[PDB]
Design a protein that fits this description.
Order of helices and strands of chain B: HHHHHHH
Order of helices and strands of chain A: HHHHHHH
Number of helices of chain B: 7
Strand content of chain B: under 5%
Protein name (chains B, C): Hemoglobin subunit alpha
Distance between the termini of chain B: 22 Å
Number of domains of chain B: 1
Largest interface: A-B, 22 and 23 residues
Bound molecules: protoporphyrin IX containing FE, nitrosochloramphenicol
Largest sheet of chain A: none
Strand content of chain A: under 5%
Largest sheet of chain B: none
Number of strands of chain A: 0
Keywords (chains B, C): Acetylation, Disease variant, Glycation, Glycoprotein, Heme, Hereditary hemolytic anemia, Iron, Metal-binding, Oxygen transport, Phosphoprotein, Transport
Distance between the termini of chain A: 27 Å
Number of domains of chain A: 1
Pfam family, one (chains B, C): Globin
Oligomer: heterotetramer
Helix content of chain A: 55-70%
Structural class of chain A: mainly alpha
GO molecular function, one term (chains B, C): oxygen binding
Function (chains B, C): Involved in oxygen transport from the lung to the various peripheral tissues.
């Protein structure tokens, strides 16, 4: 990322309620790309959109996932090292196709657009697209 | 397939877009050029700077085509046939780019539809834009 | 859309596969696990070693489904209905992986059909595997 | 690439007639993915697969492209630096969507499989997949 890009990322993330945005992004992933529900068989009712979005276990996991994402924004020059441990986790224990990381990235971008409206300008989006691509790349990196 | 609920959601959302459709199409293109720069390779003759009237005019065409698709959501292949010919045999835009524009159309709608862009409507709009993309690439080979 | 020539080409080429259809399915799966290791995430409790009964058995299942498809090339949605249900509702394999298996099936055919794998047949086989993939992901949402 | 993967690539490539494989790979690209013909309006008759495959201008460009690919195999540890200015050229002057590089890489793998048959084993394929992905990434890297 460039300096203008990092500045745009940091400026918008200062306004982000990570717990709330994370539950919203994970819930929307499950609604929009419902095959992603395969990883959440124990999470209870996922039968309708309102049930997915209101599901406390979805919300709690979304908070965990975006919390780690948030932590990574402090290390934008070393995403591979920052997420290596989670990459191996997601391969070795969780068996998660890294394509899921790319889907979640584009849902998060839609959530940011929806929440922030005009403030999520085209240059801000372009910076966040680089971030979510980089995080997905980093989380995929230890797969083999 | 687009379900009855999907078509209802699409008509509802695109109806709320109403007369802003053209502006939103331009914005979606701008978002695409900045977020996915490889897509600029299809417009080497354009000024692609912010506010470009060439991007505005193309945005209007893209949006009007989507308005026409929504109006023909039950018989979209025929409505879009001329555009399927154009993209398959003259423009020859690689099919991967339609997902990029579709994502940016979805982001643009999200940024303008605080109430309407519910999770369900999001899902329907994503299916709808994928279906438009499928029709537009259906004659490529 | 599969042209008449596509159907002729696919029928002739898969006809030559004949009794090896099973073996070639197994080899296609091994090519995909090695070239595209993320696909292994769908086989976590599965003996993926070279020559395993499980990869052989699954390769046969895949190949027999393709034989079914070729035989019903004019009506693949109906011929593959149970399999499209299964992938959409239970297996839930991300759609991007069908392009990977398709490429590896195509490579397997190229390696085993020296006489048949002309440029035109290559195109037809690529379209056919893409059409099968489309049918198998048609019910995902 | 591992040392054995490098060895597998070089040993197979030492058996390749680069002119022939390049002409066929570009011809098959234009046949299998006919929208790629958009760059070659000046090349004459592309009306049938036989016309494309027999087209002398298609063959000539295939020789040039695959020759550069071939020479690049001496720099597998520095593909990005090797192809940087060619990346810039393809972006800036030629307006070539980098997806074309990925399609050509997949056609090349199919040509190698057809030409070498059983010698093009699953592990040899995996090595070449890393190669064609790396070249495509190197040629895409300067796009902005
Ligand atoms: C930015 C992207 C992502 C990040 C940073 C992330 C991070 C995390 C973290 C911190 C955990 C908790 C690990 C622990 O137990 O200590 C976790 C668990 C998990 N994640 Fe990811 N994740 C991401 C994307 C995804 C996606 C897209 C999926 C599937 C669609 C997924 C599936 C899972 C599953 C199944 C678990 C275990 C859930 C359970 O406890 O039952 N993750 N992830
Ligand atoms: C929702 C998907 C799309 C729709 C509805 C759409 C629609 C259109 C329309 C209505 C036109 C004007 C045709 C005319 O003048 O008669 C057009 C032209 C064009 N489109 Fe597409 N398009 C889509 C996707 C794409 C994508 C993804 C690209 C490239 C990244 C692309 C590149 C072009 C180009 C280069 C032109 C020619 C513009 C000019 O020279 O004025 N389109 N499209
Ligand atoms: C040409 C595309 C494909 C065809 C024709 C196909 C066909 C089949 C068939 C016939 C079965 C057995 C169903 C049964 O026993 O009831 C199956 C199962 C399965 N497929 Fe698909 N498949 C395709 C693509 C994929 C891809 C791309 C993946 C993942 C990368 C995948 C993952 C699986 C898995 C995990 C199973 C279950 C295996 C088992 O339980 O032993 N398939 N497929
Ligand atoms: C392995 C991938 C590729 C390599 C290594 C490569 C290399 C080259 C080279 C060395 C040139 C000559 C540049 C000069 O001296 O001016 C060239 C030109 C060109 N390439 Fe690429 N290329 C690749 C892929 C592609 C693909 C897939 C396409 C389009 C489908 C493409 C389109 C072109 C065009 C249109 C030219 C201009 C040719 C002319 O003016 O006669 N290239 N490329
Ligand atoms: O070949 C195809 N399209 C041809 C033009 O490329 C032409 O329209 C056509 C030819 C034969 C048939 N039916 O025998 C239908 C349509 C489709 Cl079917 Cl891929």
């Amino acid at each position: 990322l460039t300096p203008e890009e990092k500045s745009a990322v940091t400026a918008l993330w200062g306004k982000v309620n990570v717990d709330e945005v994370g539950g919203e992004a994970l819930g929307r992933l499950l609604v929009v790309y419902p095959w992603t529900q395969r990883f959440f068989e124990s999470f209870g009712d996922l039968s309708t959109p309102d049930a997915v979005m209101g599901n406390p276990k979805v919300k709690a996991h979304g908070k965990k996932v975006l919390g780690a994402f948030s932590d990574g924004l402090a290390h934008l020059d070393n995403l591979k090292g920052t997420f290596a441990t989670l990459s191996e986790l997601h391969c070795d224990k969780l068996h998660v196709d890294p394509e899921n990381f790319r889907l979640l990235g584009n849902v998060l971008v839609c959530v940011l657009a929806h929440h922030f409206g005009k403030e999520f300008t085209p240059p801000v989006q372009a910076a966040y697209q680089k971030v979510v691509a980089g995080v997905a790349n980093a989380l995929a990196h230890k797969y083999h | 397939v687009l379900s009855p609920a999907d078509k209802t959601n699409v008509k509802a959302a695109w109806g709320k877009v109403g007369a802003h459709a053209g502006e939103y199409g331009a914005e979606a293109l701008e978002r695409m050029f900045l977020s996915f720069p490889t897509t600029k390779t299809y417009f080497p003759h354009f000024d692609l700077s912010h506010g470009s009237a060439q991007v505005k005019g193309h945005g209007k065409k893209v949006a009007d085509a989507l308005t026409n698709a929504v109006a023909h959501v039950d018989d979209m292949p025929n409505a879009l046939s001329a555009l399927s010919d154009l993209h398959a045999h003259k423009l020859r835009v690689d099919p991967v780019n339609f997902k990029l524009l579709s994502h940016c159309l979805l982001v643009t709608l999200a940024a303008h539809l605080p109430a309407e862009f519910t999770p369900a409507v999001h899902a329907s709009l994503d299916k709808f834009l994928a279906s438009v993309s499928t029709v537009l690439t259906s004659k490529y080979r």
